[PDB]
Design a binder for this molecule. Structure first.
Ligand code: KP5
Length: 138
C-alpha cells in the first residue's frame, strides 16, 4: 500500500550481487508498469510491461541518456496478469541486470550505463498496487 509513483533510494548506487525485490499486485485492466533505475536524470534501465501495444502484451526495456531514449530491447514472454500479485527480482550481475518474475527468469539487460555506483534511485510507476520495494546482498 505504498504510494505510486514510488522512489526507492539505492544508497551508493548498485553493485554486482545486489538484489532488488518489488512486490505488488497489477491493477484490474492495467495498461502499463515501469521500473526506472536512474543515474540522476538518466535512466540506466527502464523495464516497461505494456498490456496493450497494438493488442499485444510486451516488455520494453531501454536506457535514457540526456533525455533521449536509445535502442529498445523487447521480450514477448509476458508473465504479468491484470489483477494478480507479482514479484519482480532484479539481480545486478557484472555485465547485466537479470530479471526474474514470480521466480522464473524473464530477461537480461546488458549494462549501457557503466557507473553502477551512480545508479542511486529506483522509480516504480504505473498500474499497480505496490506492497513493498527493498534490496539485499546475495
Ligand atoms: O523506449 C522506451 C520508451 O518508449 C516510449 S514509446 C516508443 O516511442 C518511440 C518514438 O515514437 C517509438 O519508436 C517506439 O516504437 C515506442 O516504443 C514511452 O513513451 C516511454 N515512456 C513510458 C513511460 C511510462 C510512464 C508512466 C508509467 C509507465 C511508463 F512506462 N514514460 N516514458 C519509454 O517506455
Amino acid at each position: 500500500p505504498l504510494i505510486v509513483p514510488y522512489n526507492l533510494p539505492l544508497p551508493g548506487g548498485v553493485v554486482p550481487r545486489m538484489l532488488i525485490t518489488i512486490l505488488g499486485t497489477v491493477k484490474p485492466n492495467a495498461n502499463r508498469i515501469a521500473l526506472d533505475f536512474q543515474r540522476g536524470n538518466d535512466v540506466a534501465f527502464h523495464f516497461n510491461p505494456r498490456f496493450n501495444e497494438n493488442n499485444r502484451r510486451v516488455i520494453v526495456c531501454n536506457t535514457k541518456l540526456d533525455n533521449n531514449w536509445g535502442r529498445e530491447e523487447r521480450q514477448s514472454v509476458f508473465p504479468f496478469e491484470s489483477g494478480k500479485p507479482f514479484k519482480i527480482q532484479v539481480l545486478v550481475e557484472p555485465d547485466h541486470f537479470k530479471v526474474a518474475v514470480n521466480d522464473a527468469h524473464l530477461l537480461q539487460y546488458n549494462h549501457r550505463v557503466k557507473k553502477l555506483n551512480e545508479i542511486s534511485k529506483l522509480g516504480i510507476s504505473g498500474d499497480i498496487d505496490l506492497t513493498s520495494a527493498s534490496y539485499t546482498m546475495i
